[PDB]
Amino acid sequence: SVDCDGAILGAAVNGKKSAHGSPTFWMGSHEVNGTWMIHTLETLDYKECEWPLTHTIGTSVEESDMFMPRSIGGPVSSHNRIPGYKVQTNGPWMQVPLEVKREVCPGTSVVVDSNCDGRGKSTRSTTDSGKIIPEWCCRSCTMPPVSFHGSDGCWYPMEIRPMKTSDSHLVRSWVTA
Amino acid sequence: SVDCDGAILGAAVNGKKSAHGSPTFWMGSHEVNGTWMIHTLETLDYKECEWPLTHTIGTSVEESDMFMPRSIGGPVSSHNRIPGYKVQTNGPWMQVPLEVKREVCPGTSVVVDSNCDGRGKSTRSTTDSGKIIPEWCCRSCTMPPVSFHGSDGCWYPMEIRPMKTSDSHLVRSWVTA
Numbered sequence: 047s048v049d050c051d052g053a054i055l056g057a058a059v060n061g062k063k064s065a066h067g068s069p070t071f072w073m074g075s076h077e078v079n080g081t082w083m084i085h086t087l088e089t090l091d092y093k094e095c096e097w098p099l100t101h102t103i104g105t106s107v108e109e110s111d112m113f114m115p116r117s118i119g120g121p122v123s124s125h126n127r128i129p130g131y132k133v134q135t136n137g138p139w140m141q142v143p144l145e146v147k148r149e150v151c152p153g154t155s156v157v158v159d160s161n162c163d164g165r166g167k168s169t170r171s172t173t174d175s176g177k178i179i180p181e182w183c184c185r186s187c188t189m190p191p192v193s194f195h196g197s198d199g200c201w202y203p204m205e206i207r208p209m210k211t212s213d214s215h216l217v218r219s220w221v222t223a
Numbered sequence: 224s225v226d227c228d229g230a231i232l233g234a235a236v237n238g239k240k241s242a243h244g245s246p247t248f249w250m251g252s253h254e255v256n257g258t259w260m261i262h263t264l265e266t267l268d269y270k271e272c273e274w275p276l277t278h279t280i281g282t283s284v285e286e287s288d289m290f291m292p293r294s295i296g297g298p299v300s301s302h303n304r305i306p307g308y309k310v311q312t313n314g315p316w317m318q319v320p321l322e323v324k325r326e327v328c329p330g331t332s333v334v335v336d337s338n339c340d341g342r343g344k345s346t347r348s349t350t351d352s353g354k355i356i357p358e359w360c361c362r363s364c365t366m367p368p369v370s371f372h373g374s375d376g377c378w379y380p381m382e383i384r385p386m387k388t389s390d391s392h393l394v395r396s397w398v399t400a
Contacts, residue, residue: 057280058233
């Protein structure tokens with residue numbers, strides 16, 4: 047119900063490139079194959095506020111197609127999207143400072159398999175004793191996998207699930223955005 | 224039916240300043256009293272195409288509320304707006320190169336009066352004989368009056384009407400956007 051401070055916000059488009067930005071936030075997007083998608087996403091801060099429409103490029107989306115949820119500052123825009131992933135309602139958004147990469151978490155692997163579990167809470171690549179979880183799957187996300195690199199290490203999006211692992215030592219995000 | 228060429232278009236916001244631009248077009252806007260409005264509008268070209276929503280900042284407005292009509296490249300945005308004036312369906316948009324000013328046409332005057340005629344076709348400040356029409360009125364537009372400065376001289380928006388003058392002497396716009 048509250049917009050973020052538009053006085054310190056910016057956005058820009060030029061040809062096939064775009065960006066939404068603030069001193070604690072940066073989302074860089076391109077157009078590839080006629081589709082706009084995120085290539086850069088950095089957050090130094092977690093806050094519950096909404097990107098003002100006055101500073102939004104191409105307001106468009108079915109909200110579920112956004113990547114960064116609207117309630118924590120994600121621009122309601124076609125530019126805020128990653129093909130193969132849907133809105134990260136329970137993403138690791140509190141693990142700031144964060145950056146998104148298209149890259150396997152260290153020591154892990156992700157396979158696309160329709161038999162994999164569906165979307166769940168975002169999960170860290172390491173257990174609560176710092177042991178790496180080697181094998182992950184997703185039903186239909188696009189490769190190379192989306193990964194969040196944040197304060198306490200590497201996290202996967204909702205789509206990507208841990209395999210062959212006890213649940214009790216998993217680390218999940220508390221975010222409900 | 225056809226969007227403009229996105230590869231050469233651009234748009235940007237920073238704080239209280241914004242702009243939409245192409246090699247043949249420039250709209251500069253800013254936020255005054257919590258409201259966004261055009262401060263600069265230059266066209267080097269007249270074309271019937273639509274500004275792609277992907278390259279539009281703050282897609283929002285009811286369309287009668289825009290200043291530059293959608294069908295000739297006007298960004299469907301709250302940034303494309305001048306208070307006191309509505310969509311220039313019959314503006315002098317063919318008189319390129321054009322620039323919009325907040326300024327009385329040379330040798331003329333504009334007064335605000337409820338009893339004046341309503342919106343009509345945009346009319347040149349001079350007659351077909353090069354004679355200047357000295358007095359103009361508008362029902363409720365805002366001062367200083369907007370004026371279009373183009374190829375064959377100075378024109379007024381749809382809201383600003385010529386007084387004490389004969390219809391046969393008047394030069395009007397053929398634009399229906």
